[PDB]
Amino acid sequence: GVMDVNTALQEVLKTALIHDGLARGIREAAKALDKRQAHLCVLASNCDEPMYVKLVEALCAEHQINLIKVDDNKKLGEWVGLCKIDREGKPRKVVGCSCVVVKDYGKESQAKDVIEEYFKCKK
RNA sequence: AGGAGUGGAGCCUGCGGCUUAAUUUGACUCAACACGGGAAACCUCACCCGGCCCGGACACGGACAGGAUUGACAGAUUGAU
């Protein structure tokens, strides 16, 4: 509870990158849900297609997947690792995706308390 | 001084010429010519006719997760799943 929800994606996408559990993309990210093993999805409200959100909110809800609301979709390309770093630590090449799906969690508890208390409050 | 010969004959293998889409090529007195350990069906293979592939490291710019190449049944096309 010491960390905010809008920054709660950061450390969990870092600790799950070491196990290759981040579905960059949209089609293969949605097909990970049809493997019935993914655990969370993030929708960026800065969107481009009205057809795009109404399918993914229909897929994640009926198969019991919650949601993390972050605004911008070029912003989500950083923590998935889809952006190339510069020499001193800046994303010199910005490539941002609008759908991020995790499959397996990292081995920690600094995010595994805050994502759980964000989960249980909307039940 | 001799012996066996070779050069004549048939065939086997080299080398020139001619021929060819190509008949890959080096070596030309001893000191090139059953030599390249060279007895090539394919491979060897260089040569000829046709076709596939990148096995183009890395550095930089674009495309870029409303995507970059990739792989693939059938049908036609093909020498050819």
A25 touches strand B (CB under 7 A): yes
**Three-state secondary structure of chain A:** CCCCCCCHHHHHHHHHHCCCCEEECCHHHHHHHCCCCCCEEEEECCCCCHHHHHHHHHHHHHCCCCEEEECCCCCHHHHCCCCEECCCCCEEECCCCCEEEECCCCCCCCCCCHHHHHHHCCC
Total domains present in chain A: 1
| Domain, as residue range, for A56 | 1-123
A44 touches strand B (CB under 7 A): no
A20 touches strand B (CB under 7 A): no
As a rounded value in angstroms, the CA-to-C1' distance for A27 and B51 is 37
A31 touches strand B (CB under 7 A): no
